[PDB]
Every structure is written in structure tokens, then in C-alpha cells.
Write a protein that binds this ligand. Structure first.
Ligand SMILES: Nc1nc2c(ncn2[C@@H]2O[C@H](COP(=O)(O)OP(=O)(O)O)[C@@H](O)[C@H]2O)c(=O)[nH]1
Lengths: 263, 301, 297
């Protein structure tokens, strides 16, 4: 993530650029401008059709340097992070402006509040479990919607389906959930819509891309259970795209990742 | 006796009327209507009709509608003078979805008792399809007299375990036929109790929004159990309760009992609304030997 | 010392014959199976060792009336042919699905013919479903009544408790083999014994003169599959005084064994009597059958 707390998540400062796992150097929000902001043509976009922006708001240029990627071609949807309550008024003062161009020059954004992520863990955590125990959720809004095209499985979804509903959609939330043992797919879908993260606003939206993962074990009958919980669930006149995923490291778990759009 | 001409519009219909043919389904005449002429090469329909000048019914029911209409005559020659005319399909796409409201409408204008036997999409089959299907079902109901609908959703219970997609629509391939088989055999292969075309006419006529269930069994009280399950078939949705019009049929071997017929029938009417009009029908089918089938058809609400 | 036990199992009426073929297909051995029925349609389709036509063949749309007078008639009418069929048996199981007619009223006869001959006679039968109507539940209680006073031992199993709506259609015709597990529940101890053998004579004491009995199985590895059987509602929880209990286990291989044995007696009045046993049925990996018959009241 193009940020002094968004780099440390993916799995201007000199000692930060040199930890990017795939194979400048002189540093506040506006730091991303004459240390970060490079040319008008830096995607002459080449080898693929999307990449994501994991540039939240929990460090350095995650505010003034985040929307450097937003105007990159004014399709890409950023998976951000609104700051915790206790992380000061100064980081909260960098809230709207650090997201404003991420929802004026960028396609769509998924404003994952770690404030609300208090319900994901055990009881108490730390600042070190705000870019670690909030990587799990931070990958979700990404991985949820990549896996439909990279690794589908028992059901498939086009390139043009995601990019035909999640295109320039601006305001967007998600909602995730997990389950093992019986009822798996409907247990986790009923977690997915009730998860303190979609802010109970799916019914207001007009376009939802439900994902659902698990082994190749994953029955065709389980998938039909979750699918129903959507036709009732969202506005009864929306644009919904289902679709499945294969991940055989889950075995018995089924990663039901819902994503919202169309407010 | 009676001229039964089964028509399978849609790709799903034309695919399902093949299953009919590859099962025998006597006393009918098969007609496959679809847009991509290519797809009709694989049909074993005795008659095949092509309805597509240009489409490059590409997921748009309104092509299918127009297609059905621009071949309004082609069909009204295929359907001329025919006591019983069926119009099975897969609602969801376009060729069926749009068409059936015509082919059916055409049979009905031709005075032929017209029975629809269509399916609703799996909800995994996307959300568009549902809505496509949904106004298309509203379209038959308002066109053909009876419309047995079979929600696929319901077809896939947990007692059909790790299935597939081929197996899925194959599970439907049987079920479409079953709402046909169990109305036609009455007329086309009546066993000990005759129920002539006329009877089915009066129960089916004007009814609509019909449902159906199926149950086979054997052993002690076989016909009770085979009937019991059909009553409880999820494919009905607790509807038996209130159906003012019920068509049953206890298809079994030549030597099927009266005591048997009686107490399976007597198990149906009791579920049914107590005012409900009812009809027995037995059918001779040797492929069972030791077992019996039962196909209650709730109709009118 | 000719270790041979002559064990036969007759399936009377559709219920019995159905059940006997379910026994044939699921691979019970060491036993002559017998199908007796009124319709010769279903007899020729059965794979029973010896099939017997008793009922007068009846014109289309009669016969199938389910009047246990007519079944009782049919066997008493062909009582000779039944006497020879079960002649020099050692132990004769008698299975049926009560409520009906032919099996309802036919079992009483065949059971009581095994008795005069001098077999250990056993009745493994079922009480029809509650939805089948009052006439059958009536017609069953009388056929049960007779068979209780014909067989040395009778195992009655409600097909109503054997259900617990959509897919419990495959909870009668694939749940009736409770009858089968009822039979091999005793048979497979003598015919295919395990690491603890318990021959015919062990059984002859703990059955001859009981009258009434009940059963329950378990699937499994054997540590956690043992409780399963006694607790199974099928047994009516009537292990607060089952005065004469039998128990069996099937698979590969003492610790496994004594896991369950260190439990059995902890149930009913242990002043009575219990018999253990073992079976070699290599048709099952981690699974091991844990059948428990509970006689004597
Ligand atoms: N019974 C049956 N249903 C099918 C088959 N293939 C697909 N379906 C279902 O029927 C629906 C209708 O599609 P279809 O009739 O092929 O589209 P159309 O030919 O353009 O009307 C689909 O959404 C599927 O859920 C099949 O072979 N048999």
C-alpha cells in the first residue's frame, strides 16, 4: 500500500521500498507529492487488466500519497483502512481528504474500518494486530474478487462481470465470514451479511458480488444454499454475481466473501 | 384415442424431450423447437422446427418471443387438430422463456388442452436468469391452462449428495418428463381403472399454477409409502393442503391391487383441501414389477 | 465333532422377500434363504435359495387385499411344503413386515412349523408405519401377537421410530435392513466367528423361551463406537432390566473387544446373563458392527 502504514501488509522512505516481495529515498500526508508523485504516463496497464491499492490510512503517505494511484487512469478498486478510534484525532483529521480522491479519481473503494474490526480476533490485541490481524480482512476485499477470475472452480465468472458491475462504483463495502462443520456455506453467508463491516447497508446497494470458496469437495448443493441468501437479502431488484472458488488449503472451511456497490 | 403431441421449446426443453424419448414415453409425438438449427441435429424429435433469422435467442427472451411469432404459422401447422398438446421448456434463457407463451397460446387457440411443464432456474444459475424466467412463468400461466412449474432449487435436496452440472440438469431431465409421463400414461396406457381424456380435461382445464410430486416404493404397504412420499415431495411446497383439483395416478404392474389403488388414493384426498376435486387413474407399466409409482398433481389455489 | 449349524431364514410376503434379497445383496452367508409369497411375479425376481408359491394366483385387481386370514390360510394350506423346506433345520429365522396380509398371517404358521420340527425359531419383524393407517397397525398387532406366541424369540422393530420427511423416503426400503442386522446379529456369530467364537449352544440358552426381544447397532475406532448401540431408541431404553442379553462385534481384530465389554454389563440387572462374541467380516475398514440383542422379560 502506497503509504507509511500500507506497505506493511502485502503477503518516499529509503528503508521501506526495500521490502517489496516481488522482484524514493527522502521521507505527514503531503509527503506523497515531490517524493512520491511521478509522471503522467507510468502504465504504458501493460501485462494485466487490474492491480489493487492496499493503501489504507495508518501511516505516512496514506492520505496525500494514496490517491497517486487513483488518477492512474481517470479499472482499479482500492482496499483501504479507516484508522482506529485511539490512533488520535490527527489521523482522523486525515480521513476524508485521504479517501476523497480515492472516491473521485479512483473507480471504487472498499472503506474497511479497523475501528469496526474490534470484533475480529479474541478479546484484546495491539497496534501490531492492526496491520497483521487486519491483514486477513485487508486481503479479503482484494482476494475475494480476484479469485473469481484467477481461481474459480465449480462455478465461473467473466472478466467483464466484476468489471461490468464494480466499475466506477465509488462508495463500496464488503462483509466476510467463515465456517466449518455442517451448514458451512449458509452458516458463513449468514455471518457474511451480519458482519460488523457492511454497516447493515446491503439493501441500499444496487449490485453485490458474492464470492464463496473451500475445497473441490465443496458441493454443488451447499453453493445453492448461500445463493438464495442474497435473492431475499439485497434489494429485490439488484445486479448480483455469484461464483465459486477453489482453495484446498481450507479443506473443510468455506470463505464466503460478499462485496457491495450501487448506493 | 387421443392425439398427444409433446413440444420441447428451449434448449432445455429440446434436451429434456430427448430424455423422454430415451425413456420410451409412449403415446406422444415429439417436437423440438430451438433457435440454433445446429442444436436440433442432436435432437431425436420426430419433428424439429428452426426459429432464428439472426441472433449474433441470445439470452434475450424478446428475440425468442419474436422468433416464436415469426414462425406462428409453421407451428400452427405442426399443432393442427390434436386432442392433447404439451409445451415443456427451461425458463431462464430466451428461446424457451419467450417462445412458450406462443406455441402454447397457439395450441390453446387451436382448442387443444394445453399443458405446460417448465422449470425455474437453479439460483446458482445466476440472478438474471431467475428474473428472465420469472416474467416468463407469469407469461405461460396467463396463456396455457395448466402450468406445472418445477423449481430446480427444490430438486436438489441433500439426499442427492455430491452431484455435478451434467447430473444436475439430468435430475431435471427426468423431472420434466415426470410431469408429462404421469398425465399421459393415464390416457395412453391406462391400466385397470380407465380415466379417459375427458376426465383429465375437466380437472386440468383453466386451472394453472399446478404443482407435482413423485414417489415410488415396494414391500409391505408399498402403495401407501410410494404415495406418501409423492405427497411430501419437496417439489410441491406444502401445497397439497389447499389444491381445489388434484390429478393422481398409481402406475404399476398389470396385477396391481384394488385394495392397493384404494388406500393410496385415500391417502391423497386427505392431504388435499376437503372440498377438492380429485381423480384416480391407474396405469400399466411392467418396468416396475414389484414396485409402484404415484404422481399427484395439485392444481388451483 | 462336525461343527455345522443348519440355519435358514424365511421371508414371507413382499416385506420378508424384499428383506431376504436385501440380505442376499449385502452379503450374509452360512444360511439357506427362502422366499414365500402369493404373487409369483415377485418370487421369480427374488434371488432366494428356495422360493415357494403358497397363495392361489389371483386375477387382475384382487388378491393384494392384505387380509391376514388369507395368508394364514395360504401356509396352513401348503403346510406340508413348508415342513419339508425347513426339515432338519437347526435354527429358523422368520422375517416379515407386519401390517400386511401374506407375511402378517404367514409368519405365524411357518414359525410354528419350525417349532414342531424342533428348530430354535426366531422372528425378526417390523411394525408398520404410523401413516399406513389404523387397519394395518391393527392387523400388525395381531400378527405380532401370534408370532410372539409361535417363535421362541421375537424381535419387534417399529418402522415409525426408524424415521426421525423429504429424504426419509430412503428411510424405509434402505432402513428395513434393520431386519438383516437383526438376523446376522445372531447368525454371523456361528457362521463366521472371530477371535472369540460362541457357537449355536451359547445362543440356544439365551433365546429358547424368551418370547420378547429388542435390538440396536453401531457403526465406527471401536472405543468411540460402543455407546452407540445401547442408547439407540430402537432398544426402547429397555436395558433397565433385559434379563438375557447378546452382543457381537465384526471386523479385523482384544483391546478393541474389551473396550465395549467393559460397558455392556453396566446397563441392566447383571444377576441375569450376558454372552459376548466376535465376527470376521472384512467388508469394513475403520467401521466395526456393534449389534446388541436384549431378550428375556
Ligand atoms: N431440463 C433441463 N434443463 C436445462 C438443461 N440445460 C440447461 N437447463 C436449465 O434450463 C434453463 C434454460 O436455458 P435454455 O432453455 O437452455 O435457454 P434457451 O434455449 O435460450 O431458452 C437454464 O438456465 C438451466 O437452469 C437440460 O439439458 N435439461
Amino acid at each position: 500500500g502506497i503509504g507509511g502504514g500500507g506497505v506493511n501488509a502485502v503477503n518516499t522512505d529509503a528503508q521501506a521500498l526495500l521490502m517489496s516481495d516481488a522482484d524514493g529515498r527522502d521521507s505527514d500526508p503531503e509527503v506523497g507529492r515531490k517524493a512520491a508523485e511521478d509522471a503522467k504516463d507510468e502504465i504504458e496497464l501493460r501485462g494485466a487488466d487490474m492491480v489493487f491499492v492496499t493503501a489504507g490510512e495508518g501511516g505516512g503517505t496514506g492520505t496525500g500519497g494514496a490517491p497517486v494511484v487513483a488518477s492512474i487512469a481517470r479499472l482499479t478498486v482500492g482496499v483501504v483502512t479507516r484508522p482506529f478510534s485511539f490512533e488520535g484525532k490527527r489521523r482522523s483529521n486525515q480521513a476524508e481528504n485521504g479517501i476523497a480522491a480515492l472516491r473521485e479519481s479512483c473507480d471504487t473503494l472498499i472503506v474497511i474500518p479497523n475501528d469496526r474490526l474490534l470484533q475480529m480476533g479474541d478479546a484484546a490485541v495491539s497496534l501490531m494486530d492492526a496491520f497483521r490481524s487486519a491483514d486477513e480482512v485487508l486481503l479479503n476485499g482484494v482476494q475475494g474478487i480476484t479469485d473469481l477470475i484467477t481461481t474459480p472452480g465449480l462455478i465461473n465468472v467473466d472478466f467483464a462481470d466484476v468489471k461490468g458491475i464494480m466499475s466506477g462504483a465509488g462508495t463500496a463495502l464488503m462483509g466476510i465470514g467463515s465456517a466449518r462443520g455442517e451448514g458451512r456455506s449458509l452458516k458463513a453467508a449468514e455471518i457474511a451479511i451480519n458482519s460488523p463491516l457492511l454497516e447493515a447497508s446491503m439493501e441500499g446497494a444496487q449490485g453485490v458480488l458474492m464470492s464463496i470458496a473451500g475445497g473441490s469437495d465443496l458441493g454443488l448443493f451447499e453453493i445453492n444454499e448461500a445463493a438464495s441468501l442474497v435473492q431475499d437479502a439485497a434489494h429485490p431488484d439488484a445486479n448480483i454475481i455469484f461464483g465459486t472458488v477453489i482453495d484446498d488449503s481450507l479443506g473443510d472451511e468455506v470463505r464466503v466473501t460478499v462485496i457491495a456497490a450501487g448506493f
